[PDB]
Curated annotation (Swiss-Prot), chain A:
<dbReference type="InterPro" id="IPR006176">
    <property type="entry name" value="3-OHacyl-CoA_DH_NAD-bd"/>
</dbReference>
<comment type="pathway">
    <text>Lipid metabolism; fatty acid beta-oxidation.</text>
</comment>
<keyword id="KW-0276">Fatty acid metabolism</keyword>
<dbReference type="InterPro" id="IPR052242">
    <property type="entry name" value="Mito_3-hydroxyacyl-CoA_DH"/>
</dbReference>
<dbReference type="InterPro" id="IPR008927">
    <property type="entry name" value="6-PGluconate_DH-like_C_sf"/>
</dbReference>
<dbReference type="InterPro" id="IPR022694">
    <property type="entry name" value="3-OHacyl-CoA_DH"/>
</dbReference>
<keyword id="KW-0520">NAD</keyword>
<dbReference type="GO" id="GO:0070403">
    <property type="term" value="F:NAD+ binding"/>
</dbReference>
<dbReference type="GO" id="GO:0005759">
    <property type="term" value="C:mitochondrial matrix"/>
</dbReference>
<dbReference type="InterPro" id="IPR006180">
    <property type="entry name" value="3-OHacyl-CoA_DH_CS"/>
</dbReference>
<keyword id="KW-0496">Mitochondrion</keyword>
<dbReference type="GO" id="GO:0005739">
    <property type="term" value="C:mitochondrion"/>
</dbReference>
<keyword id="KW-0443">Lipid metabolism</keyword>
<comment type="similarity">
    <text>Belongs to the 3-hydroxyacyl-CoA dehydrogenase family.</text>
</comment>
<dbReference type="Pfam" id="PF02737">
    <property type="entry name" value="3HCDH_N"/>
</dbReference>
<protein>
    <recommendedName>
        <fullName>Probable 3-hydroxyacyl-CoA dehydrogenase F54C8.1</fullName>
        <ecNumber>1.1.1.35</ecNumber>
    </recommendedName>
</protein>
<dbReference type="InterPro" id="IPR006108">
    <property type="entry name" value="3HC_DH_C"/>
</dbReference>
């Protein structure tokens, strides 16, 4: 009932993944990015993915109508203020840089409707910190989707210390309407999934640095013994060694009493060499 | 193998008969030993059923089942069980006194060059082997349940395990169809050492009031692709087991903040709610 029009700021992988599922679920989407070329690449990829996905779901015509109708609900705009002026729900999905996210929320709030809900997709920062400059924080919250968004069912919905119950309940309801399985978390570093997987990866690295077991043995053991789809070093390569490094460095300094948070000489050495994992074709492993 | 032809296994619980099964199927002779005849007859029946099932050529298959089962003999006395054994695997209840008693019995009767191993995940090999005269011939074979289906074998050396003993163990692990990984006698080896503290981190998250228990579970299943979530997984290991393990780590490494006990876990264990085995834990079964 309350949300019919969604604006999404950021047309990188997660932003356009969000626009894809939001539009497929029947909402109108406004996709904003000042980078006009990224905006174009994103629209093409949404189109290719929605066409591709439509195949599995009635008749041939019936598939092709779905595609056209879905795409018709996605519009683009190169200006953040213009794009958010009339949205009920606004989702920031920009890279993990806190000052950039703040800058963007400053611009959103100069232009958005009073009763509109504002969300961030971040996992690297606290909602309280992203939201620090806002006039109304009772309408701000977190929608942490997982890449690739059209494939992953999970959605972490996060309340800061100010999110109203009204805002929260609407977020949970939006998550469910876009086909997600929501789980509720508070503004705590790493929410549920990172707060647990990242220190687990750091523990595997520590075990390796002690010389207790080899790197590929550890990975094999977790895959075969715990039935995980990836072993922890692969998982790190997949998240990015620069992300895991930055998140852990952040926690270490912010919670100084938490012994579990600590940097790893081995992770730092790889990042210092620019072996950042899958994304650069080299991390713990090569690709 | 050239060296290993006879394997004795003591304990006919789930792990011991799974071991007996994959060992016999790989073409070794197995003696399975337990003082309790009911347990043994139960194990022999489970094994033949598991072998029949997995076998599914219509004679060719009957013959495999028969030949496989012909390579397993049973025995109600530790000393008779080990008399001709090249390798002995102890797969008893996680009770250190009990394990040590079995090794005092093996040692009275086993061959002079036979290899001795425990399957334990609850105790340091240095503790299990403390009474032994030749620690150079001793090591760990930590299989995973259900053994006929789980590929992983943790092969553990203590401080005294000889290079030759360790090489025979890795070679044996591979011969019975497993993927071996190498570990030292460090607490929890590889899997428990990573999983058990991850489970405590989850219980601590929950105890902090940050998220609910079923959301934490659903998050790890859907977000990380784990087959079970941490609370579910604790219930499956048994909470008394994960409590006991983590208690021992805490006692030994009192400066390691990661090993702190959880009140929640203590409460459930105090009440006898031990997870899947008492049909209660974090969830009801």
């Amino acid at each position: 009932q309350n949300i019919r029009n969604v604006a999404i700021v950021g047309s990188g992988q997660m932003g356009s993944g969000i626009a894809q599922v939001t539009a497929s679920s029947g909402f109108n989407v406004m996709l904003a990015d000042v980078n006009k070329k990224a905006l174009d690449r994103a629209m093409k990829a949404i189109s290719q993915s929605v066409t591709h996905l439509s195949k599995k779901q009635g008749t041939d015509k019936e598939k092709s109508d779905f595609v056209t109708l879905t795409m018709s609900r996605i519009k683009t705009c190169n200006n953040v203020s213009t794009a958010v002026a009339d949205a009920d729900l606004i989702i920031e999905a920009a890279i993990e840089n806190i000052d950039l996210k703040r800058g963007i929320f400053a611009q959103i709030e100069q232009s958005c409707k009073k009763d509109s809900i504002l969300t961030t997709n971040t996992s690297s920062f606290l909602l309280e910190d992203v939201a620090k400059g806002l006039q109304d924080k009772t309408r701000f919250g977190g929608l942490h989707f997982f890449n690739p968004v059209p494939v992953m069912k999970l959605l972490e919905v996060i309340r800061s210390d100010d999110t109203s119950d009204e805002t929260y309940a609407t977020l949970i309801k939006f998550g469910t309407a876009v086909g997600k399985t929501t789980v509720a978390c508070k503004d705590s570093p790493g929410f549920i999934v990172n707060r647990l997987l990242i220190p687990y990866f750091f523990e595997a690295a520590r075990m390796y640095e002690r010389g207790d077991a080899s790197m590929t043995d550890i990975d094999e053991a977790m895959k075969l013994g715990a039935g995980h789809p990836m072993g922890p070093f692969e998982l790190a390569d997949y998240i990015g060694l620069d992300t895991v490094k930055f998140v852990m460095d952040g926690w270490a300094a912010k919670y100084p009493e938490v012994q579990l948070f600590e940097a790893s000489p081995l992770v730092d050495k790889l990042v210092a060499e620019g072996k950042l994992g899958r994304k650069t074709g080299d991390g713990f492993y090569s690709y």
